[PDB]
């Protein structure tokens, strides 16, 4: 399948999307961007540049790579 958002292929562009990322979310922009996730600007809601998979309600103890892979098995980025 196709890369859903090529504008967010750069890990640096994913990091820059984390403006006003909330304190309660616990996971950092650095970890989320490294797992292919960028910020949508809403709550703690992130999206994968590769599969377009959407993730929210991050809890302390979550790992960005694990949640991404477990919920989106079709994703080429975390496969």
């Amino acid at each position: 399948g196709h890369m859903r958002n090529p504008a967010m292929y750069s890990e640096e562009a994913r990091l820059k999307s984390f403006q006003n990322w909330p304190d309660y979310a616990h996971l950092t922009p650095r970890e989320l961007a490294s797992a292919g996730l960028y910020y949508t600007g809403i709550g703690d809601q992130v999206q994968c540049f590769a599969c377009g998979g959407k993730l929210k309600n991050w809890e302390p103890g979550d790992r960005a790579w694990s949640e991404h892979r477990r919920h989106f098995p079709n994703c080429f980025f975390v496969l």
């Binding site: 959407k54 993730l55 929210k56 979550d62």
Partner: peptide
């Protein structure tokens, strides 16, 4: 985390 659509 939970997925959403």
């Amino acid at each position: 985390a939970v997925x959403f659509f």
